[PDB]
Amino acid sequence: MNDFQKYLSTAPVLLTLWMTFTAGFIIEVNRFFPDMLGLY
Amino acid sequence: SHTVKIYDTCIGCTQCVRACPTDVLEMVPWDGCKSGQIASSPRVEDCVGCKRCETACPTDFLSVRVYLGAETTRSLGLAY
Amino acid sequence: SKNVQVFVEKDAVETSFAKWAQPGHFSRTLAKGPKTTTWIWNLHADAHDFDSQTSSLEEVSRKIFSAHFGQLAIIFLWISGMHFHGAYFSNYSAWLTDPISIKQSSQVVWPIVGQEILNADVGGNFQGIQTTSGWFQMWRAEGITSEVELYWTAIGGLAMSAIMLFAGWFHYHKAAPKLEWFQNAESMMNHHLAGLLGLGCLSWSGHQIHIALPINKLLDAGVSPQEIPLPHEFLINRDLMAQLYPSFSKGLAPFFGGNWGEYSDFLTFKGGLNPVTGGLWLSDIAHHHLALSVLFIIAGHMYRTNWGIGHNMKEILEAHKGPFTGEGHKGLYEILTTSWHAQLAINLAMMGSLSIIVAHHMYAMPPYPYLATDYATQLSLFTHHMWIGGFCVVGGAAHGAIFMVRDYTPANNYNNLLDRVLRHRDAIISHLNWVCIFLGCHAFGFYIHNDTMRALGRPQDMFSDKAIQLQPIFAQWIQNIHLLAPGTTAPNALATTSYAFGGDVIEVGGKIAMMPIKLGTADFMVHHIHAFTIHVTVLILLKGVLYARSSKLIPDKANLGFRFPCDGPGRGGTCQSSSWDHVFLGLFWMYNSISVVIFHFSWKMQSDVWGTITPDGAISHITGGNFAQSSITINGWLRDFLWSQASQVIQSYGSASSAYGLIFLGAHFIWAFSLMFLFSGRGYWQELIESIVWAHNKLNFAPTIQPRALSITQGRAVGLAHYLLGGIGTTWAFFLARAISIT
Amino acid sequence: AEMSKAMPFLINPANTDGLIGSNGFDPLGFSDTFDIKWLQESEIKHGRVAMLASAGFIASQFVNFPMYSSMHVDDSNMAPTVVGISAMLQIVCAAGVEEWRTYKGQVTMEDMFTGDMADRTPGDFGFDPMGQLKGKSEAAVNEMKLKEIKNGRLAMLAIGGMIHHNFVTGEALF
Amino acid sequence: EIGGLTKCSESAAFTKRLNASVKKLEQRASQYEADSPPALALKQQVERTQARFDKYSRSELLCGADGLPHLVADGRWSHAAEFILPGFGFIYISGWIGWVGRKYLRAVSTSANPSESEIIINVPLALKIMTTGYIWPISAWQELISNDLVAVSEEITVSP
Amino acid sequence: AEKSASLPFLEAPPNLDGGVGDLGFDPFRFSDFVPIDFLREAELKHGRICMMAWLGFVAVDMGFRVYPAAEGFESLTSITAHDAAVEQGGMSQMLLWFSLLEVFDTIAVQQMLEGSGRAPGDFGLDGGFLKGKSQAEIDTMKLKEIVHCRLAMFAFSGVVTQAVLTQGPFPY
């Protein structure tokens, strides 16, 4: 477990997870609040 | 042909003279360093300009500097 | 005891996640830790170079076997996904009912951000991206009929993927074979040539004879897919098969007896293409695989194993020596049984060469139902396999050079063929250089001559079919030979192997599937250009292999390695003198070569083959036959091909083909981006980085992993990578977009 | 001891020992990765806020302040909109000034329990106007804290339920 | 109006674009039929299109002759939603990321292995440091006036 | 000769323990590749699910249903309940709660493997049945579970297959 957590703490892995999360939240925002070119 | 100069920062590691592909460098007696030896360039007429020597120097800045210059058959490595 | 035995070590490597948390464990140097950004890049570049990670062939060998299982697992998952996507996200059922109208589609995009436009109205009450891999045609030939079957093959794929992955772990961590096991070429060839290929073909023939052939006959006749009996029904009720093929009634009795003629119903040598589907008759394909199976199985009994009879490859190789070749093929056996790189070289070159052959043979002799009329799929497959082939061929050369620098031993190679080759390398390279110049000057000169003449208002002085003409007489002759073969040199055949050589126009759905392809002056000119491109590629690559260890310029290149940046600014300049650099340059020429070939295919077909034919004999080709008088000049290619056939991509915005337009532009960008890595040097970049780092330091922060510029070699690699991606990507979109429209 | 009370099948989470509402419930080991003091403070704060929110969510539906008497929304979830962004922001901004004041600028995870406030008892601000915790035994004080925590945990779950109930059901809670 | 533009609510070109767009989708839907999954999708798409144009119409966006919205960024607060307000968002988020990053690097710089903690991040510490960036504006200013942000010529420089 | 009781013609598999339900029946020797405790947990989990499943499937078919039935949820057989529950949302509810429990179970299994001392499948809830009883009876009860669990797997498998194969009343 400890060792696996270290692998999951490696730079490449963390970047992918973080970017996936970031991408996801951006996509989700556009799904519910779509087509915005300004704050209204 | 090319010009090779050695500076006082040499430490007599002998690495440069062991890397020259054409025996241009030698290790001569000296007292400025603990090793008691310094490098010399007695036969620069055979330098091809490889700069392998510089790549081997351990000093902060190369104690052995090769300045490329006039070119001859020997310096241009022409077997023909 | 036995010459061939199984030796395996139990529990060789413990399974744990410790090494996973220690990046760079494989290397002694990298293991120490990161001090500069170079460490990161080196980690990824030395990951699969097992030879440098260990000094024992056994260990290297063990890793390779397991790694291969991993690739197989990935491939299985890939195939599984395709079948699943064809079961849940496709219009196969509708297409199956009306193959001519409905367009194949197996990918659907989520309705996010207007990307839905990409979901086209393919047909069959379905909206999705039109795929071009040819899955639907293959499935029809197999006799899938339902989408439930596709689901099950998908499940099988997933299962198989898992089995392979387990095998990899098992044969590396629990039961690792020893070197003696690996070094059994005769046994391996016997097994692979009789079991993998022979039994494989025989098994496939069984499926084709008992399941595919019957179902496809019913489909072609007109029976609705739902009305066709399930596959198992055919296997059980012999009477049903007898109705379709009236020989199954006799059973296997004719086979055990010598009367193989009775099976002429399903085993035939018809030749040509099925008029209804526009594909090769499955009966012929069944006989094909059956015949090949017998051949392979027999061939698998040629090498000695543990029963005395057979051949020993070493003896065969050593016996073949002559007056002009010294010791002959002595020493080769040891090389190929003690060097993985050497084996990869030969194997990789042959694999790539096969792909190129597949591309040619698969368009002239369409193998699947309803494939020829689908121009998009045809173009996609030809180009795809042409590329895969080029890369593999260049790769073979690369690994060949790695052998010379890492595994070649002068002692084991005295006066053998290899030694003698390296002893007259100057002659070989000198002559090839001339051949390349000759071909290049004459071949390309023809085009430049014509351009000048047409521009100067002197059309009568051009090398054209209407002026000075350069006809491909030899090829024209072979075509006639092949056309008249059926009934003469091939008495039992009924038609030409391909209608390309000659014959009638096969049309399916009002569209031309195949037609005689004629060869004239333009064809002569282009074919010779292909020769020039290939020859130059060989020059660069061969020079790299022959001069890998030494040269008059750098007598000790071997010690420097296979991938060194240079030897220095001396000797007038020694930049890019490694064998790796020769491969680097070879890839650029391979790109050029393949690009011209695929363009030839695209224009020739759209001009002299593809098109529509009326109920009466009126053939209208897509481009109108412009190839003859326009492909003889460079301006013609720029105007009548690139400029005109690119009208689709550039005008794709607002349509389901918009993606291709965006990718076309994106690829151009990446191609240009690469030119900054290919023209610049590390020095400028390193100095720039210094100034940037100053800023970070001025604000009291800077990375301990000191930022450094990419190595000389990496710079070149990054440049080549982006260059290739951009160039190939651009054509990819260009072709696909154009094809969708023409189809 | 070696096994947690709440999860008899799991090893007892240390650092979760001897605290006010400890039942050994820390399956994911947040108490090891992060500081216990911050966690304790956060729990108490969340609880107190949730308590108030729950009460308000119920009250607004039936009674409105004189100022907002004109605008009455039973859904409560729709109240934020009717009141206005400015009013909402005034409340949040004012909360900020008060948070800063109370913590004296130590408002980050790296400073809240450092320096002078390094000895601060999580959740203690010294707010006892009624002085009902006067001259009470340590035990009594502790039992009182337990009550706050337990009621707080309940409120945290309750408020979420109320809000999401209205979202799903579509109408006022009552 | 500013620059001779016209409000999109009052631009005929804008409306023409809307009608045309919807028509295209509707024409496609005609081929499919009734509750066919394809038709329902196209129908939903037209709703989104109508909504988008409506939103822009109710906005303060100014359209040009082409009937396309044009943004104003000269500092006027009348059109702050177009650039100024969104701009603050970027600055806040970007500063947050930069500040927290610098903090972590400086924090792990004094560790046993300062380079191992850059390739294998200490997630627990990182998360703590990341949360403390919401007040980056204040912290940064405080660090500047404390002579702890900008260094003082004790940094490596080129030979010349 | 260390022969498996179940298979008198085969050597008893090593790597196995002497715990309840150990009759030496591991012809394929899965135990060699995977820790025994993990396997024991799996056996119990599969069986305990099957035991419960059998009861539910049968009862629903027999007629025992929640009185305030949801939309539909009437004129529906066990064979057809899954989809109905999915659309109603019952399956989602179950999946959510079950998955949450599995998460905690994951933590449990890891600790067990690391040496926490947790007996495979033991979560602590005994209803007081094991309270006070000695190992003898404790083990006896455990064995009885195991037997029931193994039998249950056969039972559930049969009921489902038969039912779908032959749509009909409880006794298929």
Ligand code: CLA
């Ligand atoms: C359009 C760009 C272009 C052109 C024309 C060439 C031309 C050539 N390259 Mg080259 N190359 C290029 C781009 C180009 N390269 C790029 C981008 C790269 C980077 C990867 C390389 C990398 C590269 C390598 C690594 C190699 C070449 C080689 C060659 C030569 C092939 C021999 C040959 O056909 O001679 C004929 C050359 C011609 C230009 C033919 C046209 C000339 C006319 C039509 C023929 C008649 C003219 C007559 C001789 C004189 C007329 C007199 C009057 C005009 C003054 C040739 C000089 C190979 C070589 O040198 O081996 C022989 C080789 O090894 N190239």
Ligand code: CLA
């Ligand atoms: C060659 C393999 C392949 C490829 C390229 C695709 C590609 C695609 N599939 Mg598909 N599929 C495949 C195999 C494949 N599939 C197989 C084998 C199955 C059977 C299980 C399926 C079943 C399937 C379904 C059921 C669906 C798709 C869908 C899709 C599309 C959306 C993909 C998606 O989920 O995006 C979004 C991606 C995600 C949601 C995944 C999240 C990203 C993860 C978290 C990043 C990875 C984390 C990283 C690895 C961490 C590393 C940790 C370390 C231990 C390694 C996409 C075109 C979807 C679709 O088309 O809908 C219309 C869809 O519904 N596929």
Ligand code: CLA
């Ligand atoms: C008749 C026996 C037999 C067969 C079928 C194979 C087949 C194969 N060997 Mg192989 N091998 C054999 C004997 C055999 N070997 C012997 C005796 C030796 C020792 C001298 C080796 C040593 C050896 C090495 C060292 C390597 C191979 C590799 C390979 C694979 C090459 C990749 C390929 O074509 O993918 C085709 C892929 C498939 C067809 C997928 C299916 C693969 C499974 C394993 C087929 C097994 C039979 C299957 C269950 C069908 C049963 C019939 C039943 C349904 C009625 C291929 C699967 C290479 C590899 O990649 O291995 C991982 C490799 O590096 N072999």
Ligand code: CLA
């Ligand atoms: C059967 C196929 C095969 C196999 C098994 C190998 C195996 C090997 N090759 Mg080899 N090679 C092959 C084919 C193959 N090659 C081909 C076809 C070429 C020609 C291009 C080469 C060219 C080549 C060179 C020039 C070199 C090797 C080297 C090596 C060795 C180390 C590989 C390495 O560094 O791993 C690490 C692998 C990688 C870093 C590859 C990662 C993928 C990169 C990033 C490209 C990805 C492109 C991607 C598809 C684009 C996606 C676009 C998208 C993002 C939009 C190893 C023995 C090297 C060596 O030292 O040998 C001893 C070496 O110098 N090979």
Ligand code: CLA
């Ligand atoms: C989480 C805390 C919280 C939040 C964010 C809100 C938010 C809101 N409330 Mg509200 N409320 C709360 C708690 C809260 N309330 C509590 C605990 C009560 C019970 C007293 C009420 C009673 C209440 C009524 C009666 C009304 C609102 C209204 C509103 C809305 C207008 C805001 C306004 O000016 O009056 C809200 C503020 C107050 C009424 C006074 C201050 C809020 C505190 C928390 C209540 C008592 C103060 C004290 C701290 C709590 C106990 C006292 C103790 C210290 C002795 C707004 C959405 C109005 C509405 O519906 O708008 C249309 C309205 O008419 N609330």
Ligand code: CLA
């Ligand atoms: C494998 C487990 C399992 C699964 C997946 C399902 C799944 C389903 N059941 Mg079902 N059921 C099960 C076991 C299971 N049941 C058992 C064991 C019983 C016996 C009481 C029932 C009795 C039952 C009835 C009476 C009805 C369903 C119904 C349904 C469907 C809707 C869900 C529902 O109403 O649940 C309701 C489930 C129950 C009321 C079962 C209650 C069992 C007790 C209360 C729990 C005992 C806990 C135990 C003492 C200790 C364990 C604690 C902890 C480990 C969880 C759905 C297909 C409904 C349906 O399909 O209608 C058409 C329906 O009316 N089930």
